[PDB]
Amino acid sequence: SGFRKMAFPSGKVEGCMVQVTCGTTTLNGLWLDDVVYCPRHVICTSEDMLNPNYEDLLIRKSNHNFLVQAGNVQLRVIGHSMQNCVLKLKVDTANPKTPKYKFVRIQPGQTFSVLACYNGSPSGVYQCAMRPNFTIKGSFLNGACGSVGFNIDYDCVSFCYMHHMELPTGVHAGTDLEGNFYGPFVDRQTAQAAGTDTTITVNVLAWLYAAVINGDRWFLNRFTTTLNDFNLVAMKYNYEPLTQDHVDILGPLSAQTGIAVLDMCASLKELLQNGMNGRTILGSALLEDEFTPFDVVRQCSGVTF
Amino acid sequence: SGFRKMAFPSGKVEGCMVQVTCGTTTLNGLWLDDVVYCPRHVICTSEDMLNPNYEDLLIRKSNHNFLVQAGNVQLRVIGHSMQNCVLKLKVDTANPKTPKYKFVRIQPGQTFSVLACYNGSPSGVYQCAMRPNFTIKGSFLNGACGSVGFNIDYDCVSFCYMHHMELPTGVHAGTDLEGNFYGPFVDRQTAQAAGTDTTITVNVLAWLYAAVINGDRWFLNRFTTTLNDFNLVAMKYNYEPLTQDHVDILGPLSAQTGIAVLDMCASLKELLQNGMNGRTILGSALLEDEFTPFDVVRQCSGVTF
Numbered sequence: 001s002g003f004r005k006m007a008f009p010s011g012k013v014e015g016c017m018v019q020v021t022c023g024t025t026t027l028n029g030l031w032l033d034d035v036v037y038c039p040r041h042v043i044c045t046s047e048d049m050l051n052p053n054y055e056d057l058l059i060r061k062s063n064h065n066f067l068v069q070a071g072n073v074q075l076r077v078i079g080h081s082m083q084n085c086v087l088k089l090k091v092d093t094a095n096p097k098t099p100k101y102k103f104v105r106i107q108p109g110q111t112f113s114v115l116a117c118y119n120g121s122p123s124g125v126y127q128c129a130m131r132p133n134f135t136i137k138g139s140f141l142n143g144a145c146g147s148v149g150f151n152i153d154y155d156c157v158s159f160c161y162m163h164h165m166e167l168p169t170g171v172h173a174g175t176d177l178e179g180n181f182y183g184p185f186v187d188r189q190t191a192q193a194a195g196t197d198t199t200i201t202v203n204v205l206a207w208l209y210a211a212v213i214n215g216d217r218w219f220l221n222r223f224t225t226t227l228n229d230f231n232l233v234a235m236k237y238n239y240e241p242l243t244q245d246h247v248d249i250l251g252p253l254s255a256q257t258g259i260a261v262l263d264m265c266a267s268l269k270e271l272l273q274n275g276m277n278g279r280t281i282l283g284s285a286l287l288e289d290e291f292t293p294f295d296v297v298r299q300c301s302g303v304t305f
Numbered sequence: 306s307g308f309r310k311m312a313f314p315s316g317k318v319e320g321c322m323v324q325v326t327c328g329t330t331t332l333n334g335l336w337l338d339d340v341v342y343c344p345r346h347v348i349c350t351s352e353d354m355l356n357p358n359y360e361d362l363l364i365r366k367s368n369h370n371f372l373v374q375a376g377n378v379q380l381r382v383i384g385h386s387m388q389n390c391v392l393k394l395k396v397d398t399a400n401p402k403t404p405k406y407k408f409v410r411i412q413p414g415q416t417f418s419v420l421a422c423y424n425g426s427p428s429g430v431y432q433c434a435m436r437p438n439f440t441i442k443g444s445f446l447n448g449a450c451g452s453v454g455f456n457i458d459y460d461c462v463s464f465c466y467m468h469h470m471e472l473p474t475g476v477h478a479g480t481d482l483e484g485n486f487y488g489p490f491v492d493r494q495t496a497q498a499a500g501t502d503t504t505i506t507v508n509v510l511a512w513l514y515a516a517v518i519n520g521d522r523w524f525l526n527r528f529t530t531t532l533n534d535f536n537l538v539a540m541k542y543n544y545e546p547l548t549q550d551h552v553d554i555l556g557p558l559s560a561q562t563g564i565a566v567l568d569m570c571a572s573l574k575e576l577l578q579n580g581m582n583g584r585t586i587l588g589s590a591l592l593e594d595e596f597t598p599f600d601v602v603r604q605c606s607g608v609t610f
Binding site for chain 2 (some may be wrong): 001002003005006007008009010011013015115116117118119120122123124125128137138139140141142143144158166170171172214215228279280283284285286299300301302303304305
């Protein structure tokens with residue numbers, strides 16, 4: 001028992017991290033087979049970032065202008081190209097530590113592990129949710145760009161995130177591994193609005209189920225509700241609307257606990273309307289939304305990789 | 306910027322995890338050089354655990370009763386011996402993936418990463434504090450015993466914890482890697498009292514410094530305090546007394562922020578006495594005590610391994 005925010009083991013990803021330098025700028029890259037993927041803003045000076053013409057900046061660069069180091073091994077760059085906001089550097093050696101992998105574009109509300117890296121070297125690992133507004137609340141200092149986010153299923157790493165920027169508001173924005181930003185963001189040092197963020201309702205419900213399984217049950221009440229009634233309340237509290245698809249995803253947790261999903265919605269409704277009265281759930285004094293239904297099941301059933 | 310509960314990269318430890326079976330019981334082992342370390346209670350049946358005579362039970366075991374599997378490769382046990390509460394299984398092969406390592410016994414209040422494993426396979430990674438009462442508040446299902454806790458400094462893994470027991474209250478107990486329990490605990494399935502726990506004051510202060518560095522400063526005040534006065538309040542709120550050693554450890558964070566340590570204590574005193582009034586600090590509605598001063602510095606300065 002117990003319930004913790006748990007990251008995936010990072011070993012398969014650590015073996016793919018490299019340092020990429022282009023002139024003055026160093027950041028991280030991801031080495032899979034004979035390609036290294038990194039943020040295209042590696043080619044920018046501090047001044048360039050205010051309004052970069054990436055096509056023009058890249059034209060000034062040649063293969064030998066990209067210094068790629070994998071530990072102490074210098075890779076030889078034999079080609080370069082830009083795909084959306086990522087650079088793909090073709091190298092003359094396939095990464096011998098390449099895991100089975102996929103590139104996936106994740107949905108808002110899904111979770112993933114981040115391996116924060118500096119100068120090609122892993123610093124730490126933590127779990128993140130993709131916010132409904134397509135930001136993440138990470139931990140990234142200068143040099144962290146090119147750090148990736150991922151999920152593991154069995155032996156296969158699904159890469160879903162590459163870190164590119166910190167918005168003036170202190171939240172983080174990045175791309176999938178095809179270089180397409182999540183959200184409306186661009187790789188330019190400009191004020192950028194993230195939308196209104198909302199709480200990930202299906203995740204809060206999953207976490208309430210986790211709480212019951214662990215024996216934290218004070219918030220269970222004698223009421224039920226309907227989807228439409230619940231959603232009137234969700235909207236007022238800037239929660240995501242709950243759909244039948246969400247109810248369906250919660251089915252296994254409903255079955256384990258014997259608590260109908262709409263009964264748990266009525267418990268959540270009371271918590272929203274009345275607050276938590278200084279009480280805690282699973283060691284938290286706020287409603288936690290960074291655990292997916294699958295996360296809860298995984299942790300409550302001991303799935304391994 | 307941003308501040309997250311961040312675990313160490315687990316790759317060096319993943320390469321050391323194996324499965325150990327003895328009869329009906331399977332749990333995890335740690336393979337370093339030509340020794341596999343695991344909880345000695347692997348040799349117990351469910352019934353044995355109620356009141357085991359480990360010396361007698363081990364005598365009835367032979368090398369060939371211990372099935373040790375590293376992925377799909379069967380290792381061959383050529384010896385067994387017991388050190389305190391850990392079993393050392395001598396194997397005929399040195400682990401080729403053995404990292405530089407030390408065995409360390411950590412102090413209450415210190416933090417470490419846990420690699421939760423099942424059947425010798427890594428499941429997830431999270432950061433834990435050793436509570437003042439020598440428990441940990443982990444996440445461990447059936448089969449997690451033998452999972453280890455560790456820190457990394459540069460290239461060296463310092464193992465500090467091996468998981469043994471879930472107490473009837475749902476908190477966790479375990480040993481250093483020489484098999485000595487942290488706290489008063491024993492490897493017997495019996496009711497066992499944990500101390501009164503307390504909050505790790507120096508860690509709360511470190512986290513308040515982390516908050517300031519990250520731009521959360523509402524809780525700062527121009528009140529002052531003395532160590533003796535502060536400690537009168539700490540005692541009332543079941544906080545650990547703060548010593549000059551603790552003040553000294555917070556010195557670098559004091560210097561970075563320009564906030565004297567006793568000024569931060571006066572801020573903490575107000576938070577304890579008056580509560581947080583529905584406000585948050587670093588995304589938390591409670592005072593967080595699982596970040597050490599060194600953890601804060603590490604994360605705020607981007608140290609890598």
